[PDB]
Symmetry: C3
Subunit: 273 residues, 3 copies
């Protein structure tokens, strides 16, 4: 019913040192599902234009099953809004818990110089009309949002073919995964404990990336508050030539909020800064 459904069993390969699902991996999965919904509407390849605020109510563990459902709520001109629901199920108890509810914005790409005009989302249920109207306000918010200490972390990732679509365009989800890895390192470096992602703030993907180009990641704590730490990550891009000349492209800047727990499952308080 307009939904794209992905199901993933959580393996050690998706895990952190604690037997928990890497938040970056989950973000990758989410972006993939959403992108598939978008492309299912568009009929052409789509890329992650932006992401709204994402909060995680639960942290999934190895052995559990993640279910991700994405849907196109509304098409505009070249962009569209995707609603995402993430559920976790324990396979010993049978219990389902909501992990996340979020929105992401995807943009349809032409092959060449094709203009692109998206057909409208067909509406049936009343809730379809409701979400169809809310999509406009949420979009307005998204657009207006573009009104815009030595424990730093630096990292670098080379963009290979499995990190982009078949046209060569880097996945926003991969970037989000790498981002999350680096940020987590920063948080850990502040608390010397075990950080788990509480949320990611809304941000835009400002420019495209391509296979073969370098992504420099710069993470640093921006603020702290009781049990929450905020890490800001910057993603800058260079093709080989740009890499040689030091002139990069600001791909994106995001803010990730973490909690943390020690080597016992008890929560901890971050120092003030």
């Amino acid at each position: 019913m307009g939904e794209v459904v992905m199901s993933q069993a959580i393996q050690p390969a998706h895990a952190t040192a604690r037997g928990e699902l890497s938040a970056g991996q989950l973000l990758k999965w989410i972006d993939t599902t959403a992108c598939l919904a978008a492309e299912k509407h568009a009929g052409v390849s789509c890329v992650t234009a932006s992401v709204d605020d994402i909060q995680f109510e639960e942290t999934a563990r190895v052995g559990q099953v993640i279910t991700i459902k994405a849907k196109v709520t509304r098409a505009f001109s070249t962009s569209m809004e995707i609603s995402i629901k993430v559920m976790v199920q324990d396979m010993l108890t049978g219990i389902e818990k909501l992990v996340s509810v979020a929105f992401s914005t995807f943009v349809a790409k032409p092959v060449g110089k094709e203009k692109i005009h998206l057909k409208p989302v067909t509406l049936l249920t009343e809730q379809d009309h409701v979400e169809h109207n809310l999509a406009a306000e949420r979009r307005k918010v998204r657009l207006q949002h573009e009104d815009t200490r030595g424990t730093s972390v630096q990292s670098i990732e080379l963009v290979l073919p499995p990190h982009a679509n078949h046209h060569g365009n880097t996945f926003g989800g991969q970037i989000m995964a790498w981002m999350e890895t680096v940020a987590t390192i920063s948080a850990s470096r502040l608390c010397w404990a075990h950080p788990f992602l509480k949320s990611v703030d809304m941000f835009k993907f400002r420019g495209p990336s391509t296979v073969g180009d370098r992504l420099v990641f710069t993470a640093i704590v921006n603020n702290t508050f009781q049990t929450c730490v905020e890490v800001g990550v910057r993603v800058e891009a260079f093709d080989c030539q740009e890499w040689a000349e030091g002139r990069g492209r600001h791909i994106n800047s995001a803010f990730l909020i973490y909690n943390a727990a020690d080597d016992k499952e008890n929560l901890i308080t971050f120092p003030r800064i």
Copy 2:
């Protein structure tokens, strides 16, 4: 001696939540080895045409070493039959156990409009002639075989470059791996325990897949019997356009038989359906 040998140490990255080798990973490895044997005979790229019945006598664990040997038993016109032997060795005891003995059929692909004629397999030992004759009967069987409850699982995989050969053709082994993941989720969802793969029934790859296209996987228990559960998986393919229009290609349908164990190493009985 016509054999292709692969050796793989089993790491957490190849593991399930139980420290056992993912059956899908093993299937990937098997298909790869077999394909390498086939291409070693053909001199051109080959794809997985079909797979005979595969039974697993053992389940390998993290720390153990898998050895896979493949061989071309007989070439026909464009296809050939590959015999596969899978052994596991424990690296603390030195003990080897047979994991599997199976056959797979591979088809040589031309580059363009080239006709393809395969040279015969050279025969030395008598057992080479024996298997060369048996290959005909086994083939006859393969060809004749094409005479052809709410715990469902749905999943989706985007086919990226590491999932296909350099011409863009999706590996049958990758499809088998994904299949296995989804199916395992279904079985778990029936028993709420820990399923391990007992076997896979013979099936054909009905059509090609290509980088960039979506594979929709649909798993559902078809039957049960004492300690065995049967999960059927369907694999449907869509390029982006087909994805938009809902017209897919039936790539394949397979049937996987599992057992299961609880959080103790004791076997369990599945309910009747």
Copy 3:
């Protein structure tokens, strides 16, 4: 300051059966960082020409963070020398330990028939001049170095797009990773315990490899001495046609020295051979 910095948290996906970082993975990371430094100097794609001796003072564990820093010490004509420093940090204690200090030689590749002339490394500090001079001697040594029992291991790897750069050239680091896997299997097969990499001897990458070609790996113990075992690995390459005809290309031959520990953290002595 001419440095390229990569930071990697160590996950189960990077781990062995013992919760330690795979040496091959570390080698991959090292080669990547170094290559990025090289390309940052050259402005074009670079490949691993050779590697000096690498010794590992520590073995990192899951949960710890690897930091790798690479730098171009000196450019010659088409080649350049890269100095690499590998540090590990425990994220519970905050303690850093040096893992490695090594040198690698990278070669700039033209796109077509372009001649390639590298600009000199700018020198500031005195240590920059010192290393700039030492680079010549170390190079002289590298060039002169090209003056050149049944527990064998054989394995095979198909080179896919994630294993090469965007021009199709296989990464030396991937080859080093595969090498290490196979070698480790050999060592384990000698001691029936848990080998960890002590060092790798300097070796040259004699020829290029390309996406789609097979890498046959042959590992075998060459010698033993008290607590050290030496495993030699050979890497031979075949495109599909070459694969069919049995005429390969000797890509490289390396020698890896291991120690080992039993299922207690106590070191062990290898038998004489």
